[PDB]
Specification:
The chain has 313 residues and is mainly alpha-helical. It is built from 14 helices and no strands. α2 runs parallel beside α4, α3 packs antiparallel against α8 and α8 runs antiparallel to α9. The structure holds 5-(2-phenylethyl)[3,4'-bipyridin]-6(1H)-one, magnesium ion and zinc ion (ZN). The PDB classes it as hydrolase/hydrolase inhibitor.
């Protein structure tokens, strides 16, 4: 356990910031992840040999899709890490352990398609799981990987702690279903304004961790503009392939997914920042004030999209 992980100076400093980009070197992503677990949870919360084997099995089960890939998994885990490090005392030993793993695992074996497309195509996963289709799959793949010989990073936990951490991970991954986000934020909003929000209420924690998962999952909108803009290209590469596949089933896709309607991209972003990103990070800052930088960066990027529309770039 005397084996620390250390990053080069620039990464060591930049990694603490909400807008850190993990960079184009795939082979450094596992070290970045281990470094985040060690600083977030202690050097003592996982057997390194088991952690390393788990990370490489998780990596192996992300597919080579334009956006919902291994890079996304680590980007989302880094954002969660920035949140946990800026709210040290608000989270239990187990929550910290569970949530970084939840984030690395949250999109396992994603095929590049929405729950909507699964249902319309009539994929087997849509009969097996009627709602949060991909998200029940991702949690399923997580549990499968935990049961591979030498992969149970949670072996040291008491039997009850083990059930607590797998329940934190399960609610965490399900919460990445953006259809569940809207109600979840409205309830948190109401509960914080009426003053009822109580973090000793497990069901209240659940909702808050759900909102953090949405915040970490959407964190491309909180980066520096060139990262945000270039991540949007990869996001649209999947959306447009899905629209192509909708058209192949005889269905007109929503314009966001229709590569004929690229013209409408800037206005689509406006919609999304106003309907989703800004409310998400607004509510998140109200409940966890040290996450304000996510809201500020999101606001700057909305402003950058406004400039794109006004032909100023
Ligand atoms: O970072 C993201 N991750 C996921 C989403 C998303 C959109 C719709 N449904 C589910 C998740 C959008 C963004 C960024 C904003 C964005 C970029 C590109 C296209 C449209 C919106
Ligand atoms: Mg997902
Ligand atoms: Zn995701």
């Amino acid at each position: 356990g005397l084996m620390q992980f250390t990053l080069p100076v620039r990464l060591c400093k930049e990694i603490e910031l909400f807008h850190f980009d993990i960079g184009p070197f795939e082979n450094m992503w596992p070290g970045i992840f281990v470094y985040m677990v060690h600083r977030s949870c202690g050097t003592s919360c996982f057997e390194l040999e088991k952690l390393c084997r788990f990370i490489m099995s998780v990596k192996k089960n992300y597919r080579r899709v334009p956006y919902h890939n291994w890079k996304h998994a680590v980007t989302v885990a880094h954002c969660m890490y920035a949140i946990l490090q800026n709210n040290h005392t608000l989270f239990t030993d187990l929550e910290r352990k569970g949530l970084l793993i939840a984030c690395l695992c949250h999109d396992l074996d994603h095929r590049g398609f929405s729950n909507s497309y699964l249902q319309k195509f009539d994929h087997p996963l849509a009969a097996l799981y009627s709602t949060s289709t991909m998200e029940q799959h991702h949690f399923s793949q997580t549990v499968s990987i935990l049961q591979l010989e030498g992969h149970n990073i949670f072996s040291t936990l008491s039997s009850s702690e083990y059930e607590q951490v797998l329940e934190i991970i399960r609610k965490a991954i399900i919460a990445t279903d953006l259809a569940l986000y809207f109600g979840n934020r409205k309830q948190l909003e109401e509960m914080y304004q009426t003053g009822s929000l109580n973090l000793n209420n497990q069901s209240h924690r659940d909702r808050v961790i759900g909102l953090m998962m949405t915040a970490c999952d959407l964190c491309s909108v909180t980066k520096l503009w060139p990262v945000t803009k270039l991540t949007a290209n990869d996001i649209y590469a999947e959306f447009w392939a899905e629209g192509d596949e909708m058209k192949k089933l005889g269905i007109q896709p929503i314009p966001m997914m229709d590569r004929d309607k690229k013209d409408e991209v800037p206005q689509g972003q406006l919609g999304f920042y106003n309907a989703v990103a800004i409310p998400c990070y607004t509510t998140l800052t109200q409940i966890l004030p040290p996450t304000e930088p996510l809201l500020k960066a999101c606001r700057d990027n909305l402003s950058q999209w406004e400039k794109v529309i006004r032909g100023e770039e």
